[PDB]
């Protein structure tokens, strides 16, 4: 483990998300994992400003965004100009927890 | 970091076995608590089994008082009441497989 | 953590998969986790030769195969004669990341 950021983000509708970013070295490979939790429900996209460390981490993904599975539906996390966006495929009465990762050489 | 790791096997009347692992981790200002669940068995109704006091204690700590958990074929809710662990499922599962549920807190 | 193998595997349609195998000891219990990532899409099964360490890890599962949930669908990983197979329930336009684990005494 060469990194562990955690932070809580909030929009003005009141929704809170906690994120954890983690980096791990495995010989030739690196793993980067995003962890997300919210107790809230969500109907539209979630937008909130992120710290520079998180924005930096989130930009590193090879696809420029993080496909993430929650118990009730699927989201895409991306960052743009220090604004974090989580878009969802369907409205979620509760978000819950999920993670998204990639492995790289 | 890791300030806790309980693991146990629980069993019901039919003979359905679940293994659980509870984990706590400290991340500066934040704590993460993760429940991991595995069963090779299929499940049609709810799974009820007695849990150790450490596990019951861990499971009760959740801000919603229950653990929403995704398995490969369906969704479950884990809760504890009076030292009885209950896993309720949205649909019957021919195989449970593995899943995790966590939360982050300040 | 008593083990961490990671490798990249590749098939004839251009699809690359990264796998990480992990073993952890927890007092009386062991946990074995497979992690899988691919940025590619996948229509049929994914077949690729694996290292001996990975074949060995994958054979250890009590069911002889790993049921694994990806954001858009479900897969079964198994190994036979050092050939890794990932079968899918539906075609996946993108595979993303997932893990599968078991606990044992």
Author numbering:
A (entry chain D), C (entry chain E): 240 to 344
B (entry chain F): 239 to 344
Sentences reproduced from the published study:
Trimeric fibre proteins protrude from each of the twelve vertices. These fibre proteins have an amino-terminal virus-binding sequence, a central shaft domain, and a globular, carboxy-terminal fibre head domain involved in initial receptor-binding. The SnAdV-1 fibre head is the first Atadenovirus protein structure to be solved at atomic resolution. Despite the low sequence identity with other fibre heads, the topology of the beta-sandwich is identical to that of known adenovirus fibre head structures and contains ABCJ and GHID beta-sheets (the E- and F-strands in the long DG-loop of human adenoviruses 5 and 2 are absent). However, it is significantly more compact, making the 107-amino acid long SnAdV-1 fibre head the smallest adenoviral fibre head structure known.
The structures of P212121 crystal forms were solved by molecular replacement using a trimer of the determined structure as a template and refined using NCS-restraints at 2.7 and 1.9 Å resolution, respectively. When the structures of the fibre head monomer of the different crystal forms are superimposed, no significant differences in main chain conformations were observed. When trimers are superimposed, the r.m.s.d. is less than 0.5 Å, suggesting the orientation of the monomers in the trimer is also fixed.
